[PDB]
């Protein structure tokens, strides 16, 4: 009974998703580590071993939530998809943060010993930062308290927990691993305060102005914990997340692979939505380097890449139910301009 | 015969480094808890006092950890639960007496072995008051938790539910006194500096007589929360009722470079051990060269975030050596070199 290897789970996550080679390794080797940890009963030298969660950084779109996604159903072990957006200060009306371990008994059947040894992502964490608010006049309710509440459940804790929804379970947390990952907005800003240097309005000083310092793939891969300080993350809470992982904007040569590699990419979507109807699709290279450069000016990532297709292709599926004996379409590069109309083929 | 506080000591020393007078105060209230609990009543002075515990101290400085080593060498009952999940008697989020029936799952529901039990506290600062905040309002979480702990510190009677009840008919409550029950609270204060410094410098003076700060690096955390009174807490949040049940303060002083170096080897649970011990399994050894600590030292203190900061910089190191590590055959040991802490050099690895 062999576990998996870090180049074999790496396989499958490259199979759907594309140019992330840094923050792939940092998943293998903790869900490796994690059977480790698990494979071993706290009877060797080395007890009270040690954990290490993961901190997610990208920017919009760039996939954080697809490998999570991916990750799950391959997983042997239980996997949740949770959210700090509905948590509040222990005592408000939005929500408890013991819900995030009821949600992850459904997927175990309610089997504690089952769902010690699983696996928590969290979604949108940048949204929990005191914005610029470090005095602290009044209590975030929605913010700063609910990092307070996470502290102690990253290092372990046991937890109420409603069975079925007047008594409580107990579920310890030392050994459950978190990946929480957010777009963090801005963050390139106070960053570059510490690298610029560059003021220069005297005479003495130099001012360097040369546009280049907003080097997003570049930038982040120079973060640091104090960074994440000034932004509003409390340096408690960054400690219970050793690692971090920062992942790199599309490119325009990335955008071309996500839709013919990934087997949901939207190239082979579209293709079973015609397929249904008995009608093929086709995309040929010249139209994929021009929706590139289309997505990259919308600064919104892969997720922006739909509204080039489907505005493209809206007028054509209007008409295409009604017509008849359309065996094919192909799409050239001047539709996505507009200055041509998509080639159909009778038959 | 009871315990020693220099054999107490001697044991938490061996999870614990560099923290000579946060282990004295432990030892001595662990010592006299014993005590007080042997002879209650029973001897020519009566009314015996108490004296809880106020641990202070940066992060990562190993006030969460005393707790969970005095756990396993002490033999009374004791609980380690939190003040951020508690409310103000009667709303959703929790009630204090939860505290005390997490006391009972431990002592199997023994009332007189739960009352001479040890409780403690992690983050305590989160229910600090908002100095400025608006007067219509009702701090819950805050003000309303330590004015419910007042009379539990002091001691007083709690209705507690045995086992949750079966259901309606029971309709019952048990009677757990708290007089004699301890009391070990514990949190990172945060911009508790920035108070001290207002009333120990009193300067920060523009004009000319005024003494202007000579450095931008002044008022060590260390030596700075060793001025530290109980008033200071008061600007801070807290009530002056509420510290007034925990006399005792002790204060922690952040890591060193030369006591991180010792963390990863004297202790028995430290990391170096930790991943030695990962590797042993994979029939794998490990090495760490001295003059690699030592540059991880710097490292780790350059975040400010403590020994917890320290996985980091290993897993970040180690991160590219794990991933090929499985693919990799007839590979028998491993060597860590100080260019790969830098991230100049790779590390290189035996065959065999
Ligand atoms: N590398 C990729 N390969 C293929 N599709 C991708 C890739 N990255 C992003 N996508 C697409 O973008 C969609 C959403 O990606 P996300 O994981 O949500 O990115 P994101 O960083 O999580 O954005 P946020 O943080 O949720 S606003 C996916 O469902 C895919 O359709
Ligand atoms: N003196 C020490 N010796 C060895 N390891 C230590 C020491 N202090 C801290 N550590 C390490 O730091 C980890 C956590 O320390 P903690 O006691 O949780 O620090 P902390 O101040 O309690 O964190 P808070 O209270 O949530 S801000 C331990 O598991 C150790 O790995």
């Not at 040894?117 to 006049?137: C, E, H, L, M, T």
């Not at 360097?208 to 809470?237: M, N, R, Y």
């Amino acid at each position: 009974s062999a576990l998996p290897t870090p180049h074999e789970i790496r396989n499958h996550l490259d199979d759907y998703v594309i140019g992330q080679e840094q923050a792939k390794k940092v998943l293998a080797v903790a869900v490796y580590n994690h059977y480790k940890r698990l494979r071993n009963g706290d009877t060797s030298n080395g007890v009270e071993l040690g954990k290490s969660n993961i901190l997610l950084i990208g920017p919009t779109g760039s996939g954080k939530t697809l490998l999570a996604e991916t990750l799950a159903r391959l997983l042997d072990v239980p996997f949740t998809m949770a959210d700090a957006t509905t948590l509040t200060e222990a005592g408000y009306v939005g929500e408890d943060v013991e819900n995030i371990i009821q949600k992850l008994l459904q997927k175990s059947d309610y089997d504690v010993q089952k769902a010690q040894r699983g696996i928590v992502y969290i979604d949108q964490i940048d949204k929990i930062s005191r914005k610029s608010d470090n005095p602290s006049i009044t209590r975030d309710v929605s913010g700063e308290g609910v990092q307070q509440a996470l502290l102690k459940l990253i290092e372990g804790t046991v937890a109420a927990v409603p069975p079925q929804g007047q008594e409580f379970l107990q579920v310890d947390t030392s050994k459950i691993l978190f990946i929480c990952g957010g777009a963090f907005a801005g963050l390139d800003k106070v960053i570059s305060h510490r690298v610029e240097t560059g003021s220069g309005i005297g005479f003495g000083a130099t001012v360097k102005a040369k546009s280049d310092k907003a080097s997003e793939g570049e930038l982040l891969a120079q973060v640091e914990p104090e960074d994440l300080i000034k932004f509003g993350l409390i340096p408690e809470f960054i400690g219970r997340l050793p690692v971090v992982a920062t992942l790199n904007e599309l490119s325009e040569e990335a955008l071309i692979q996500i839709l013919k590699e990934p087997k949901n990419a939207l190239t082979k979507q579209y293709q079973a939505l015609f397929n249904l109807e008995g009608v093929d699709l086709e995309f040929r290279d010249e139209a994929l380097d021009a929706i590139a450069k289309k997505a990259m000016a919308r600064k919104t990532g892969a997720r922006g890449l739909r509204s080039i297709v489907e505005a493209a292709l809206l007028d054509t599926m209007y008409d295409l139910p009604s017509m008849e004996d359309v065996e094919k379409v192909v799409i050239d590069e001047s539709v996505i301009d507009g200055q041509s109309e998509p080639l159909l083929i009778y038959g």
